[PDB]
Design a protein around this nucleic acid. Structure first.
Lengths: 233, 205, 126
RNA sequence: ACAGGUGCUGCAUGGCUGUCGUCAGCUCGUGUCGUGAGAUGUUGGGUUAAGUCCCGCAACGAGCGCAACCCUUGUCCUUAGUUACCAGGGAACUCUAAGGAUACUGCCAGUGACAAACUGGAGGAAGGCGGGGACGACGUCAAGUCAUCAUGGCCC
């Protein structure tokens, strides 16, 4: 499961781009054309980009590397979460905090606060707290976890970042360039494909297409894990 | 000049008076004057041993003075021969036996008076005020204070125009009444005038 | 023998309710003789009369402290406290009248530099 | 030797105080942006007495301020009953003075971004900060004080 076919992408509508007015001219190479004033992506390019990206994530998973799933758009909010839990990898779905990575030493305190509060809510320390104050600490837990739920167990900078809709998650791209770590990104036909090491031209707005991309990356990572588990004995 | 004394505003909520006796309206004035005389005599005499919390409590004539110092050995003396002289000198200028029992400060970097007097001695030894201030901050913070603030005010470095400088680390929440903030204010008599040294050490709740 | 304790700004009253003719004796003296204030007399007799039973209960009041109207308020509060004892259906009407609430108003202290609790000295720009 | 000096310089100073102002502000670390001074955070939508709180947001956090912890008053309980009290010697009551209970937007109905919050209602002595106080941020006025005191210098 390292090579995804063109047929399922066509079924999911991974070719529908954006209006011809919002296009990025740097996205010109892999554009089939323009029907009804909407740009069409070249699936020949998309499938090859996916093949290279899947080989890369398979290698990282076989070397036990960590890849951060990033997507905060409505189309990619929950799918990133569930596929990241499947793959055992950190994710960011609610909002990319400015400075998750460049200012990572500071976010350690917030993650540690979340972990301490989870450890006290496990054994149960609400007996010493009042009715309202226990709810105050619980709302602290929920607000802090909603922001940092996927990266609470990342423990250091990831070795790759898989972003959906680079244009939406521009801050992540700039931080990843700042820190030098590779970007596997999905680019619509309106966004900037720069500072993305593994460019995947695709429609990032469709729910089915986003689910297809994220699930495919998840299976590639999981297959890497199963192959890496073959050297135990 | 707009801040209340940290010790005084906390005198009844979490702190305690460092004078615990009872008197009658007529006797109280002379008790207090004798108390202040003993305090000034002690602070001038034991200026070498770093005493910080001389406490005067006099049960029915006989008194039990309690000095807390970071160096009890020097002030007690050899076999305890300086302490006996101090005992009799106290008794001479009070009424009847003043049993001075001497405590020991096991953390001289958490007592504000010791920190302030150290900075003052360094200032009178023509040490850079910024370095002395920063050294005190570091010492207290790594000795375990939950917060330290130190303020140096005066003609710092011989400057014609006096200025106020300060450093803070940790919390030191002055307005919290239950904060357990030790506070000290001493003066360093330099060659250009007096430099005031203020130290707030916040230790808990 | 229902017993009520009423309190006002400085006066404290203790009233004894017992079914009778309607006589009210305050400090061992009749209410009219004790209170030369018509307003104070009305204030004392009001909790009895809002629920249509003035001449139904004999009252023995003992007041202390306060002034002529503070004592009237204290007696009213104590009479309310005693009225709620015999029957709890009178409590909603007493609440609607506002007699069960103890007036917490007290003399505001004189503050420093102020001539009174709130009165400040005259200010001049020049 | 000196002591003594309420002799001078508050524009050499410490300590102390006023004042803007009990106003809600004032900053810092890391990150990011700018050649840079700097910016951001701290802005925006609400909301609050409040940089109060919530939600957004290249910011993430923290500190001093706000609030709370302190004192007094408002109801009740408990220990106690004299020199206090007086319902029938009593141990009821007031009171006295220690320790606590209660009040938390806790419950109901609506409005509100599925929020913070606001509006009204019940219960209660007290309802939203119950009333009053103390507590006065970084700093400003070369503000006041060398005549409380201490002190550099000048002077007798």
């Amino acid at each position: 499961p390292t090579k995804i076919e063109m047929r399922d992408l066509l079924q999911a509508g991974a070719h529908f781009g954006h209006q011809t007015r919002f296009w990025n001219p740097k996205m010109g190479p892999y554009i089939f054309g323009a029907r009804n004033k909407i740009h069409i992506i070249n699936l020949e390019h998309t499938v090859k980009a996916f093949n290279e990206a899947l080989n890369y994530v398979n290698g990282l998973a076989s070397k036990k590397n960590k890849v951060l799933f990033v997507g905060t758009k409505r189309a990619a909010s929950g799918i990133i979460a569930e596929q990241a839990t499947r793959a055992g990898m950190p994710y960011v779905d609610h909002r990319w905090l400015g400075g998750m990575l460049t200012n990572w030493k500071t976010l350690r305190q917030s993650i540690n606060r979340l972990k301490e509060l989870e450890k006290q809510a496990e054994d149960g320390t609400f007996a010493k707290l009042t009715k309202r104050e226990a709810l105050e600490r619980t709302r602290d837990m929920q607000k802090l976890e909603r922001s940092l739920g996927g990266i609470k167990d990342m423990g250091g900078l990831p070795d790759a970042i898989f972003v959906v809709d680079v244009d939406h998650e521009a801050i992540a791209i700039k931080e990843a360039k700042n820190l030098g770590i590779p970007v596997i990104g999905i680019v619509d036909t309106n966004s900037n494909p720069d500072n993305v090491d593994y460019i995947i031209p695709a429609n990032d707005d469709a729910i089915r297409a986003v689910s297809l991309y994220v699930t495919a990356m998840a299976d590639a990572i999981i297959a890497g894990k199963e192959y890496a588990q073959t050297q135990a004995s | 000049g707009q801040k209340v004394h940290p010790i005084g505003i906390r005198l009844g909520v979490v702190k305690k008076h460092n004078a615990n006796w009872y008197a009658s309206p007529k006797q109280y004035s002379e008790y207090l004057i004798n108390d202040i005389q003993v305090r000034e005599y002690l602070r001038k005499k034991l200026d070498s041993a770093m005493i910080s919390n001389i406490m005067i409590e006099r049960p029915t004539g006989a008194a039990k003075i309690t000095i807390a110092t970071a160096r009890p050995g020097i002030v007690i003396g050899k076999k305890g021969e300086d302490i006996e002289r101090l005992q009799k000198e106290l008794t001479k200028m009070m009424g009847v036996p003043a049993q001075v029992n001497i405590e020991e400060i096991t953390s001289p970097d958490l007592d504000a008076r010791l920190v302030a007097d150290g900075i003052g001695s360094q200032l009178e030894r023509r040490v850079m005020f910024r370095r002395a201030m920063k050294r005190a901050v570091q010492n207290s913070m790594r000795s375990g204070a939950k917060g330290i603030k130190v303020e140096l005010s005066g003609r710092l470095g011989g400057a014609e125009i006096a200025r106020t400088e300060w450093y803070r680390e940790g919390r030191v929440p002055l307005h919290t009444l239950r904060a357990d903030i030790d506070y000290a204010s001493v003066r360093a008599e330099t060659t250009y005038g007096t430099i005031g040294v203020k130290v707030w050490i916040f230790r808990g709740e | 023998r229902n017993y009520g304790t009423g309190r006002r700004k400085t006066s404290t009253a203790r009233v004894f309710l017992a079914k009778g003719t309607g006589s009210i004796v305050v400090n061992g003296k009749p209410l009219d003789e004790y209170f030369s204030r018509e307003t104070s007399r009305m204030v004392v007799r009001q909790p009895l009369e809002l629920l249509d039973s003035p001449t139904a209960y004999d009252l023995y009041i003992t007041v202390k402290g306060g002034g002529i109207s503070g004592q009237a308020g204290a007696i009213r509060h104590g009479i309310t406290r005693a009225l709620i004892e015999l029957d709890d259906t009178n409590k909603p009407a007493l609440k609607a009248a506002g007699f069960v609430t103890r007036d917490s108003r007290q003399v505001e202290r004189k503050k420093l530099g102020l001539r009174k609790a709130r009165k400040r000295p005259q200010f001049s720009k020049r």
